[PDB]
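Q: How would the structure tokens look for this protein?
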Amino acid sequence: GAASTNQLQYLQKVVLKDLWKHSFSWPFQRPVDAVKLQLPDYYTIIKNPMDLNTIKKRLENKYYAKASECIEDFNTMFSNCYLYNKPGDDIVLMAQALEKLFMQKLSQMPQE
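A: Here is the predicted structure in token form.
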């Protein structure tokens, strides 16, 4: 509705910024370079990859029609991490910390 622009700017200026500032954001900032990381199965398992810079550019470029498409992308980024890796892997514990912060930020999103 009329608050969609309000919610998308919150996702860009608060949610994305605060996740990026988090010490654990580094491995999620750019697409996984599966050649450099020697992960030849990564993009066979992860058919719908997502990363913070892709979300950042989609927000800047007004790619989203509503904030829910953006939330879906964040959700996919976290879910993909838990899918490819094992419970308890370092990257999974990093993602879980970021997801916890993400859900706090969502709980404070304006209802204007």
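The helical segments are 4-21, 42-45, 52-60, 67-84, 90-107.

The chain is about 60% helix and 0% strand.

Upvote if useful.
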